[PDB]
Amino acid sequence: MRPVYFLSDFGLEDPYVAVVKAVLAERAPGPAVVDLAHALPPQDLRRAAYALFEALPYLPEGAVVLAVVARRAVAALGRWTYVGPDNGLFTLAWLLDPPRRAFLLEGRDVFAPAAAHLALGLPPEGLGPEVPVETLARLPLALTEGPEGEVLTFDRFGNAITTLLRAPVGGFVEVGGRRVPVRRTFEGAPVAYLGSAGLLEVAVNRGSAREALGLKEGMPVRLL
Amino acid sequence: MRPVYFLSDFGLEDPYVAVVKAVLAEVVDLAHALPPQDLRRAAYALFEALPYLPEGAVVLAVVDRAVAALGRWTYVGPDNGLFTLAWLLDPPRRAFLLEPPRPRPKAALPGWAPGEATFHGRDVFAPAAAHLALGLPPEGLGPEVPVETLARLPLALTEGPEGEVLTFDRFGNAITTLLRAPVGGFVEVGGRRVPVRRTFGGAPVAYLGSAGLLEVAVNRGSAREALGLKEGMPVRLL
Amino acid sequence: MRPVYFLSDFGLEDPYVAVVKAVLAEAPGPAVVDLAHALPPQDLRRAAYALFEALPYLPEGAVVLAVVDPGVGTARRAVAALGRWTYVGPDNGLFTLAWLLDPPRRAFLLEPPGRDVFAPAAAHLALGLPPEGLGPEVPVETLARLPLALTEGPEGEVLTFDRFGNAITTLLRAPVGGFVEVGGRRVPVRRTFGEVPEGAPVAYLGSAGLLEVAVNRGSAREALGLKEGMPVRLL
């Protein structure tokens, strides 16, 4: 058996989360279901894709990453197993774990059954037709070592998360027309550092970089 | 035991939901980030999930007389009509006034005591739900009262053609009381004529929703905002 | 095995919250209950109170994991404290009010293998493993405390606010029929906030045993321009 990590964008405002749990319990009672049903932000694919990118490494290999959110539904197999919409949500996750195989799942009710099936270890070919992994939809996002990148999204504190994979110590980064020093240790001035997800982040000591620097999603970020 | 499904308007900023869960453990969440005091929104949420829940489950819902009503499913919450729609799917046979023993705080400063009647979810509903979840008799909760005395909101689902806006979802979609959405037809609400459709592909559209009620949405938008809709607004099938 | 109650100001949508839950679920594992994650960013007083509100009702021995760390990227200890309940979080005074109810018997410095030390520590304690394995033991008196004190009065202060704007004070008493002064104005103390006209100021003993100030059907915080730290006094 393999555990099911249930991710969704309910924000504790949609009772459907309980229906999904009921379906998983009825079709595959054995497998554990880790409730992360409110971990994804709704109507913000870039931020949702980033959230998965940061969390994925902490999930046990082989776990069924279930994302309940017109777009076809798919299952993808890599180090981890994925079940969700083929709308680019898993774009960043797949950079860490390029899927080896993918399958078409033949509304919102399509996901749980597929996840249960895979959780029980039943053959994927049973979910539906196999499709080439190259046909899996991807957001036009790229994580680079620089020097040019962009503001991917922001966190609740206003810190800006970028697409840059390197934060040269003693170096400087340009964003919002401001030149920010790259350090580690953090005064309402900005600072850049390699964040928890391995991506360069920009923060304002005790403040909001987003608001203080008037930053916007999609803005350019340049390592100097 | 019987599982406990929990719904409230407690929000995500306070530890109220957790405290109720703690008392219960002395639990599956339905929803907690619902608009405060919004009974219609809460009534619909229960309606939406009830049919998929295990028979005999205890539905604890706190959104504002404290009662417990028994049907195929068990209900615990305020007698303010919150359970109106759920009861259309499962009309209670018996109801009881809740007078369970108040939970005892484990830590307490000298002569310290919490305010009286300041957190019913914790001191009245939670102990009642635990009692029922354990399988203990309902009469052990308090005096029995006639189900006919239970409160209900003035919500009527209907084939139409006249209905009303029941509530809105988190995206601003309007949920109506209409049970049918004629193919190729039109629905009038807020002075606008909205086309009814099955497949989609800033524009408003009507369709039969996941709970069997006609809904009005705006592609990548808020029907509530964009169309200036409000609860109670009449909806008419043209 | 003990349950884990998790509090923070990151917001439910922050992946850090998912990571912690994944680390804690890394069968059998502890039940994980969220206290709250949408607390106002960096608001230690509000968080401290939330812990105070919930503590008396949590299972004895529960692990309280609270991560409100405004001291991000600064010198501050990460610690675990053991009492009737167990605490894991930054040594920034966040647990001040909880410790008034439950004075820690032991404290440990969480050594790194940095908030990435919190989840692992919580899991270690939830499983009932030796606290010695977390890092070096330290004196409990050295634990940081916020400059807060719950008092009998008559002088107190506005501690924090709830979502509706009700002001939570540090006063442990709310004598009905009496009066409390806040901002120079006399506010009546009643059994409940409804015993006054809509829009009128009123004081009462809250759900956590502290005197609260509200505006019936309104927001005391906004309507009265209240601020944390503001002097309050029983008349």
XYZ file of C-alpha atoms in Angstrom:
697
model
C 0.000 0.000 0.000
C 1.050 3.579 -0.585
C -0.116 6.710 1.238
C -2.301 9.324 -0.402
C -1.352 12.955 0.075
C -4.599 14.798 -0.546
C -3.971 18.302 -1.812
C -6.652 20.743 -2.870
C -7.671 24.385 -2.989
C -10.752 24.263 -0.733
C -9.569 26.869 1.777
C -11.900 25.235 4.324
C -14.844 26.817 2.497
C -15.962 23.790 0.455
C -17.435 20.658 2.087
C -16.427 18.558 -0.945
C -13.215 17.830 0.974
C -15.248 15.464 3.162
C -16.747 13.751 0.101
C -13.279 13.026 -1.295
C -12.219 11.522 2.044
C -15.388 9.382 2.066
C -14.675 8.112 -1.433
C -11.057 7.293 -0.576
C -12.162 5.500 2.609
C -14.796 3.488 0.748
C -12.650 2.479 -2.229
C -9.304 2.007 -0.427
C -9.735 1.892 3.371
C -6.229 0.567 3.995
C -4.016 3.388 2.598
C -3.385 6.392 4.830
C -4.741 9.730 3.631
C -2.705 12.781 4.626
C -5.032 15.795 4.656
C -3.462 18.755 2.833
C -6.787 19.611 1.200
C -6.395 23.335 1.875
C -2.732 23.696 1.020
C -3.264 25.046 -2.506
C -4.455 28.566 -3.344
C -7.452 28.681 -5.689
C -7.279 30.580 -8.995
C -3.491 31.024 -8.845
C -1.802 28.178 -10.680
C 1.707 29.660 -10.436
C 1.513 29.895 -6.659
C -0.116 26.456 -6.397
C 2.637 24.983 -8.600
C 5.244 26.602 -6.358
C 3.636 25.178 -3.201
C 3.930 21.645 -4.598
C 7.539 22.334 -5.595
C 8.442 23.220 -1.996
C 6.475 20.402 -0.350
C 7.137 17.475 -2.727
C 10.669 16.624 -1.438
C 9.212 15.920 2.018
C 6.730 13.348 0.799
C 7.733 9.680 0.953
C 8.748 8.222 -2.398
C 5.912 6.353 -4.067
C 3.246 8.438 -2.350
C 0.123 9.252 -4.354
C 0.028 13.026 -4.743
C -3.667 13.703 -5.266
C -4.672 17.168 -6.471
C -8.429 17.757 -6.587
C -9.152 21.046 -8.349
C -12.185 22.182 -19.549
C -9.048 20.118 -18.885
C -8.420 16.368 -19.073
C -7.512 14.444 -15.904
C -4.290 12.456 -15.748
C -2.107 10.244 -13.602
C 1.680 10.477 -13.939
C 4.299 8.058 -12.615
C 7.744 9.094 -11.421
C 9.504 8.868 -8.043
C 6.136 9.974 -6.734
C 2.747 9.244 -8.272
C 0.499 12.080 -9.426
C -3.262 12.317 -9.899
C -4.777 15.644 -10.927
C -5.807 18.083 -13.682
C -3.550 18.341 -16.732
C -3.489 22.123 -16.369
C 0.161 22.700 -15.487
C -0.311 22.431 -11.718
C 2.440 19.809 -11.484
C 4.822 21.765 -13.749
C 7.447 22.567 -11.096
C 7.025 19.265 -9.254
C 7.878 17.494 -12.505
C 11.162 19.413 -12.820
C 12.229 17.627 -9.637
C 10.647 14.376 -10.783
C 10.234 14.011 -14.584
C 7.390 11.503 -15.043
C 8.271 8.213 -16.766
C 4.708 7.376 -17.797
C 1.312 9.074 -17.928
C -2.295 7.934 -18.239
C -5.609 9.545 -19.147
C -8.302 9.161 -16.499
C -11.610 8.096 -18.025
C -15.630 16.135 -13.242
C -14.129 16.591 -9.778
C -15.312 13.052 -8.945
C -12.757 11.465 -11.323
C -9.697 12.013 -9.120
C -10.395 10.186 -5.832
C -11.209 6.848 -7.504
C -7.959 6.975 -9.484
C -5.944 7.825 -6.374
C -7.499 4.925 -4.434
C -6.736 2.547 -7.311
C -3.082 3.587 -7.321
C -2.908 3.645 -3.523
C -3.869 -0.028 -3.478
C -1.073 -0.709 -5.941
C -3.363 -1.754 -8.776
C -1.925 -1.512 -12.331
C -2.014 2.008 -13.830
C -3.084 0.682 -17.241
C -6.406 0.107 -15.518
C -6.990 3.843 -15.084
C -7.214 4.484 -18.802
C -5.184 4.970 -22.010
C -1.494 5.670 -21.649
C -0.383 8.989 -23.137
C 3.117 10.356 -23.830
C 4.644 12.288 -20.945
C 5.647 14.952 -23.461
C 1.939 15.736 -23.886
C 1.487 16.595 -20.196
C 0.603 20.300 -20.015
C 3.273 22.605 -18.591
C 3.101 26.206 -17.398
C 5.532 28.496 -19.267
C 7.703 28.615 -16.144
C 11.410 27.928 -15.968
C 13.672 27.705 -12.933
C 17.100 28.996 -13.905
C 20.540 29.553 -12.437
C 20.329 33.076 -13.824
C 21.289 35.756 -14.319
C 17.752 36.589 -15.473
C 14.599 35.360 -13.782
C 11.240 36.639 -12.563
C 9.075 37.017 -9.477
C 7.187 33.726 -9.353
C 4.785 34.511 -6.521
C 4.691 35.935 -2.981
C 4.112 34.513 0.498
C 1.783 35.905 3.174
C 4.549 38.126 4.554
C 5.107 39.797 1.208
C 8.402 38.037 0.581
C 8.929 37.558 -3.155
C 9.720 34.067 -4.411
C 11.744 34.102 -7.635
C 12.629 31.591 -10.352
C 16.355 31.876 -9.582
C 18.149 28.760 -8.291
C 21.266 30.553 -7.062
C 21.865 33.294 -4.511
C 25.561 34.270 -4.756
C 26.715 35.300 -1.290
C 28.117 38.823 -1.336
C 26.293 39.382 -4.603
C 23.454 41.731 -5.529
C 20.094 41.225 -7.206
C 17.997 43.791 -9.052
C 14.223 43.876 -8.676
C 11.623 46.626 -8.664
C 14.430 48.916 -9.766
C 16.074 48.335 -6.404
C 19.484 46.778 -5.882
C 19.197 44.203 -3.098
C 22.142 42.561 -1.321
C 22.273 38.761 -1.245
C 22.985 37.568 2.306
C 21.740 34.966 4.785
C 21.231 36.770 8.085
C 18.636 39.542 8.237
C 15.751 47.927 9.667
C 13.167 48.142 6.900
C 15.670 47.411 4.133
C 15.440 44.597 1.537
C 17.590 41.468 1.425
C 17.864 38.441 -0.871
C 18.709 34.868 0.114
C 18.257 31.271 -1.022
C 14.892 30.340 0.472
C 13.483 27.104 1.896
C 12.576 25.734 -1.550
C 15.984 26.331 -3.075
C 14.733 29.463 -4.832
C 16.026 32.990 -4.323
C 13.602 35.018 -2.196
C 13.492 38.759 -1.558
C 12.338 40.125 1.789
C 12.237 43.369 3.730
C 13.530 43.089 7.295
C 10.394 43.119 9.480
C 8.273 44.167 6.518
C 6.696 43.295 3.182
C 8.926 43.383 0.113
C 5.787 43.200 -2.024
C 4.333 46.374 -0.516
C 7.547 48.209 0.415
C 9.095 47.772 -3.036
C 5.788 47.774 -4.904
C 6.596 44.415 -6.472
C 4.377 42.592 -8.951
C 4.121 38.942 -9.967
C 5.952 38.404 -13.252
C 8.460 41.232 -12.697
C 12.059 40.704 -13.842
C 14.757 39.782 -11.313
C 18.427 40.037 -12.292
C 21.502 38.702 -10.543
C 24.215 41.336 -10.888
C -18.310 4.734 17.316
C -19.938 7.098 14.845
C -17.828 9.639 12.958
C -18.266 13.339 13.660
C -18.530 15.810 10.776
C -17.846 19.402 11.800
C -18.987 22.662 10.200
C -18.729 26.179 11.604
C -18.168 29.844 10.831
C -15.336 30.040 13.397
C -12.796 31.051 10.765
C -9.066 30.401 10.412
C -7.689 33.075 12.757
C -8.765 31.604 16.095
C -8.224 28.204 17.750
C -11.974 27.644 18.239
C -12.229 24.748 15.784
C -9.265 23.034 17.453
C -10.708 23.501 20.950
C -13.938 21.781 19.912
C -11.897 18.938 18.420
C -9.920 18.780 21.680
C -13.080 18.494 23.778
C -14.406 15.838 21.384
C -11.199 13.858 21.894
C -11.757 14.258 25.653
C -13.518 14.205 13.291
C -13.916 15.233 9.669
C -14.187 18.922 8.850
C -16.830 20.020 6.369
C -16.113 23.761 6.361
C -14.942 26.438 8.822
C -14.077 29.485 6.711
C -17.743 30.327 6.069
C -18.995 33.927 6.310
C -19.824 34.681 9.964
C -23.519 34.271 10.830
C -24.322 33.391 7.187
C -26.968 30.703 7.758
C -28.007 30.280 4.123
C -24.421 29.612 3.050
C -24.021 27.135 5.893
C -27.384 25.471 5.218
C -26.340 24.888 1.617
C -22.921 23.486 2.572
C -24.625 20.842 4.732
C -27.096 20.064 1.927
C -24.163 19.621 -0.447
C -22.277 17.049 1.645
C -24.926 15.179 3.646
C -25.833 12.493 1.071
C -22.199 11.329 0.873
C -21.733 10.921 4.624
C -21.967 7.583 6.485
C -25.407 6.753 7.870
C -25.762 7.677 11.533
C -22.863 10.125 11.382
C -23.021 13.015 13.862
C -23.233 16.351 12.046
C -21.960 19.074 14.368
C -22.652 22.505 12.900
C -22.088 25.736 14.805
C -23.152 28.996 13.131
C -25.171 31.793 14.775
C -31.826 27.112 21.777
C -29.197 24.353 21.464
C -30.523 21.066 20.084
C -29.796 17.592 18.785
C -32.135 16.205 16.096
C -32.188 12.537 15.082
C -32.891 11.126 11.630
C -30.868 8.843 9.344
C -28.055 11.181 10.374
C -27.726 12.976 13.707
C -27.563 16.754 13.972
C -26.092 18.905 16.728
C -26.249 22.672 16.597
C -28.360 25.832 17.116
C -32.108 25.699 16.526
C -32.007 28.573 14.054
C -32.804 26.866 10.761
C -29.189 26.015 9.949
C -30.258 22.414 9.208
C -33.284 23.331 7.011
C -31.974 21.941 3.718
C -30.330 18.906 5.320
C -33.726 18.126 6.802
C -35.307 18.036 3.336
C -33.049 15.052 2.691
C -33.530 13.652 6.205
C -36.457 14.983 8.326
C -35.675 14.379 12.013
C -37.893 12.047 14.026
C -36.773 13.263 17.463
C -35.152 16.393 18.918
C -33.589 17.164 22.306
C -32.563 20.251 24.279
C -28.830 20.215 25.005
C -27.907 20.431 28.695
C -24.730 18.291 28.915
C -22.108 18.757 31.644
C -19.684 21.556 30.761
C -16.129 20.395 29.941
C -13.563 20.986 32.698
C -10.484 23.136 31.969
C -7.282 21.238 32.834
C -5.280 24.295 33.841
C -6.584 27.256 35.821
C -5.120 30.279 37.578
C -6.169 30.923 41.214
C -9.926 31.498 41.299
C -9.964 31.529 37.493
C -13.039 30.566 35.475
C -14.128 31.205 31.864
C -17.064 33.492 31.144
C -20.544 31.976 31.129
C -22.274 31.293 27.802
C -19.388 32.724 25.780
C -18.445 29.668 23.693
C -21.369 27.278 23.162
C -19.447 25.184 20.642
C -16.987 24.263 23.367
C -19.238 24.064 26.419
C -22.524 22.753 24.968
C -22.308 21.377 21.417
C -18.960 19.539 21.648
C -19.893 17.501 24.737
C -23.235 16.673 23.112
C -21.558 15.505 19.909
C -19.069 13.349 21.827
C -21.946 11.823 23.802
C -23.761 10.872 20.589
C -20.542 9.808 18.838
C -19.952 7.315 21.663
C -23.392 5.873 21.022
C -24.964 7.031 24.280
C -28.774 7.618 24.326
C -30.036 11.019 23.108
C -32.359 11.431 26.100
C -29.160 11.643 28.121
C -28.524 15.058 26.551
C -31.505 16.928 27.951
C -35.326 17.162 27.725
C -36.974 15.909 24.536
C -38.916 18.414 22.445
C -41.373 18.039 19.515
C -39.652 18.083 16.119
C -42.448 20.350 14.944
C -41.023 23.033 17.244
C -37.681 23.040 15.391
C -36.904 26.221 13.455
C -36.620 26.303 9.667
C -35.551 29.004 7.232
C -38.009 30.069 4.471
C -36.151 28.156 1.746
C -38.134 26.281 -0.881
C -36.515 24.340 -3.707
C -38.728 24.285 -6.786
C -38.988 23.362 -10.444
C -39.952 26.987 -10.950
C -40.305 28.998 -13.003
C -39.876 31.361 -10.033
C -37.090 30.814 -7.514
C -34.569 32.960 -5.661
C -30.853 33.333 -5.053
C -30.124 31.029 -2.107
C -26.508 31.969 -1.436
C -23.113 32.292 -3.192
C -20.053 30.046 -3.234
C -16.463 31.108 -2.541
C -16.006 32.195 -6.173
C -19.064 34.422 -6.197
C -21.195 31.910 -8.096
C -24.863 32.324 -7.223
C -26.739 29.252 -5.991
C -30.483 29.408 -6.670
C -33.465 27.452 -5.363
C -34.359 26.236 -8.869
C -34.231 22.473 -9.472
C -34.170 22.611 -13.253
C -32.016 24.306 -15.875
C -33.641 23.901 -19.332
C -31.199 23.276 -22.174
C -30.878 26.283 -24.465
C -33.195 28.238 -22.189
C -32.657 31.511 -20.328
C -32.799 32.487 -16.669
C -33.591 36.025 -15.551
C -31.947 37.456 -12.443
C -30.961 40.986 -11.446
C -32.599 42.372 -14.563
C -30.375 40.232 -16.789
C -31.065 37.356 -19.185
C -28.528 34.581 -18.632
C -28.284 31.593 -21.008
C -28.417 28.084 -19.574
C -25.721 25.699 -20.800
C -24.127 22.320 -20.091
C -20.613 22.829 -21.443
C -18.487 25.967 -21.154
C -16.241 27.225 -23.923
C -16.368 37.896 -17.828
C -19.508 36.389 -19.348
C -22.336 34.964 -17.146
C -23.816 31.492 -17.626
C -26.425 29.315 -15.896
C -26.203 25.540 -15.417
C -27.381 22.782 -13.094
C -24.883 22.615 -10.250
C -23.244 19.709 -8.459
C -25.997 19.672 -5.814
C -28.833 19.671 -8.334
C -29.617 23.387 -8.050
C -29.407 25.935 -10.861
C -26.332 28.142 -10.574
C -25.177 31.389 -12.202
C -21.461 31.945 -12.755
C -19.076 34.307 -14.514
C -16.099 32.813 -16.334
C -13.002 33.687 -14.296
C -15.122 36.152 -12.358
C -17.647 36.706 -9.583
C -21.301 36.595 -10.638
C -21.999 38.235 -7.284
C -19.655 41.140 -8.074
C -19.987 41.427 -11.853
C -23.790 41.163 -11.783
C -24.325 42.809 -8.399
C -26.390 39.866 -7.164
C -27.794 39.482 -3.657
C -29.448 36.677 -1.684
C -33.228 36.585 -1.966
C -33.136 38.127 -5.420
C -35.780 36.454 -7.584
C -34.739 34.074 -10.356
C -37.170 33.292 -13.167
C -36.959 30.685 -15.923
C -37.918 32.307 -19.220
C 2.198 8.736 21.407
C 0.715 12.202 21.889
C -1.309 14.398 19.506
C 0.248 17.488 17.933
C -1.571 20.833 17.929
C -0.109 23.185 15.321
C -0.201 27.002 15.289
C 1.462 29.585 13.027
C 1.038 32.827 11.099
C 2.122 31.470 7.705
C -1.405 30.920 6.411
C -2.912 27.560 5.438
C -1.700 27.979 1.852
C 1.966 28.288 2.766
C 3.883 25.133 1.825
C 5.716 25.293 5.157
C 2.451 24.171 6.747
C 2.232 21.211 4.352
C 5.877 20.335 4.964
C 5.377 20.237 8.726
C 2.348 17.974 8.277
C 4.368 15.716 5.959
C 7.257 15.520 8.441
C 4.825 14.683 11.254
C 3.145 11.992 9.135
C 6.508 10.455 8.222
C 2.122 4.575 10.833
C 1.550 4.798 13.637
C 1.926 8.581 13.663
C 0.466 11.437 15.752
C -2.915 13.001 15.131
C -2.239 16.560 13.919
C -4.754 19.280 14.682
C -4.353 22.833 13.423
C -4.927 25.457 16.114
C -4.793 28.250 13.507
C -2.475 29.376 10.709
C -4.064 32.675 9.720
C -2.977 34.578 12.823
C -1.914 38.136 11.922
C 1.649 38.022 10.557
C 4.284 38.389 13.292
C 1.712 39.171 16.013
C 3.163 37.439 19.104
C 0.562 38.819 21.524
C -2.337 37.487 19.442
C -0.625 34.113 19.066
C 0.281 33.941 22.750
C -3.380 34.509 23.618
C -4.614 31.853 21.161
C -2.413 29.351 22.983
C -3.754 30.566 26.343
C -7.339 30.122 25.079
C -6.829 26.544 23.930
C -4.374 25.049 26.411
C -6.815 24.169 29.243
C -8.778 21.961 26.839
C -5.946 20.118 25.115
C -5.184 16.485 26.033
C -2.633 16.348 28.841
C 0.821 15.827 27.340
C -0.130 17.115 23.899
C 2.703 18.627 21.872
C 2.004 22.278 21.134
C 3.947 23.249 18.031
C 3.732 27.002 17.532
C 5.729 28.763 14.882
C 5.205 32.523 14.859
C 8.755 33.602 14.213
C 9.029 37.320 13.384
C 12.677 36.937 14.312
C 13.222 35.324 10.916
C 16.906 35.153 10.030
C 17.989 36.602 13.371
C 19.704 35.283 16.492
C 17.023 33.558 18.565
C 16.863 30.085 20.079
C 14.572 27.314 18.904
C 13.426 25.380 21.974
C 11.262 22.601 23.367
C 9.809 23.003 26.873
C 8.252 20.272 28.998
C 5.443 20.746 31.506
C 1.936 19.273 31.845
C 1.871 19.887 28.109
C 4.842 20.007 25.737
C 5.937 23.037 23.712
C 8.007 23.388 20.551
C 8.698 26.795 19.084
C 10.873 29.920 18.918
C 12.203 31.274 22.197
C 10.618 34.685 21.613
C 7.947 34.746 24.318
C 5.212 33.190 22.176
C 4.461 30.675 24.967
C 4.377 33.310 27.731
C 0.708 32.999 28.648
C 0.655 29.210 28.231
C 3.547 29.016 30.685
C 1.574 31.032 33.251
C -0.907 28.170 33.228
C 1.805 25.518 32.894
C 5.281 26.531 34.204
C 7.898 24.521 32.255
C 9.838 21.941 34.266
C 12.520 21.423 31.603
C 13.771 23.176 28.458
C 15.972 22.069 25.561
C 17.752 23.939 22.799
C 16.816 22.511 19.400
C 20.100 21.985 17.583
C 20.199 22.013 13.768
C 21.207 18.818 11.918
C 16.207 27.750 11.243
C 12.598 26.588 11.460
C 13.452 23.238 9.893
C 14.228 22.086 13.434
C 10.669 22.566 14.703
C 8.756 19.816 12.882
C 11.384 17.118 13.597
C 11.395 18.050 17.285
C 7.615 17.908 17.468
C 7.571 14.462 15.846
C 10.331 13.238 18.189
C 8.340 14.360 21.235
C 4.999 13.097 19.915
C 6.530 9.617 19.645
C 7.628 9.839 23.268
C 11.357 9.699 22.530
C 13.916 11.011 25.089
C 13.924 14.819 25.101
C 17.713 14.578 25.560
C 17.925 13.611 21.896
C 16.720 17.044 20.767
C 19.782 18.978 21.886
C 21.349 20.342 25.086
C 19.159 20.916 28.133
C 18.980 24.500 29.392
C 17.597 26.304 32.448
C 13.874 27.045 32.291
C 14.304 30.490 33.866
C 16.284 31.531 30.763
C 13.241 31.144 28.487
C 12.125 34.453 26.984
C 8.835 35.970 28.156
C 6.786 38.825 26.709
C 6.324 41.859 28.999
C 2.827 40.630 29.815
C 1.116 39.834 33.089
C -2.454 38.743 33.728
C -3.605 40.673 36.774
C -6.349 41.003 39.357
C -6.246 44.715 38.633
C -7.307 47.354 38.915
C -4.753 48.351 36.266
C -4.301 46.251 33.134
C -3.806 46.694 29.399
C -5.205 45.709 26.027
C -3.533 42.397 25.241
C -4.812 41.721 21.718
C -7.979 41.581 19.581
C -10.118 38.874 17.995
C -11.480 38.835 14.427
C -14.481 41.022 15.277
C -12.480 43.761 16.955
C -13.267 42.740 20.528
C -10.407 43.868 22.757
C -8.833 41.238 24.996
C -7.374 42.734 28.185
C -4.963 41.369 30.808
C -7.565 41.730 33.563
C -8.702 38.478 35.185
C -11.802 40.074 36.716
C -14.962 41.576 35.217
C -17.206 42.602 38.158
C -20.733 42.865 36.745
C -22.361 46.195 37.496
C -18.933 47.761 37.710
C -17.057 49.921 35.219
C -13.771 49.842 33.348
C -11.895 52.850 32.014
C -10.207 52.619 28.624
C -8.924 55.636 26.727
C -10.474 57.851 29.379
C -13.978 56.548 28.703
C -16.135 54.634 31.182
C -17.314 51.271 29.867
C -19.992 49.266 31.745
C -19.241 45.706 32.831
C -22.059 43.269 32.064
C -22.700 39.518 32.040
C -22.739 39.531 28.230
C -22.131 41.973 25.376
C -25.796 41.945 24.393
C -26.984 43.652 27.574
C -26.365 46.994 25.865
C -27.723 48.953 22.860
C -26.410 48.109 19.394
C -23.213 50.067 18.833
C -22.634 50.722 22.542
C -19.361 49.817 24.357
C -19.507 46.998 26.907
C -17.126 44.879 29.003
C -17.590 41.250 30.061
C -15.628 38.173 31.141
C -14.596 36.390 27.954
C -14.433 32.710 27.024
C -10.843 32.520 28.288
C -11.410 34.132 31.678
C -10.108 37.580 30.721
C -12.083 40.834 30.682
C -12.946 41.813 27.125
C -14.179 45.078 25.637
C -16.607 45.120 22.743
C -19.125 47.188 20.842
C -22.383 45.280 20.543
C -22.650 44.276 16.874
C -19.591 46.414 16.168
C -15.809 46.634 16.488
C -14.347 48.065 19.678
C -10.905 48.120 18.058
C -12.057 50.322 15.185
C -14.939 52.232 16.786
C -12.909 53.076 19.889
C -9.531 53.345 18.173
C -8.057 50.815 20.590
C -4.425 49.688 20.383
C -2.464 46.859 21.976
C -0.702 47.976 25.151
C -3.291 50.616 25.937
C -3.940 51.084 29.677
C -7.241 49.783 31.049
C -8.467 50.130 34.625
C -11.246 48.791 36.812
C -13.091 51.629 38.543
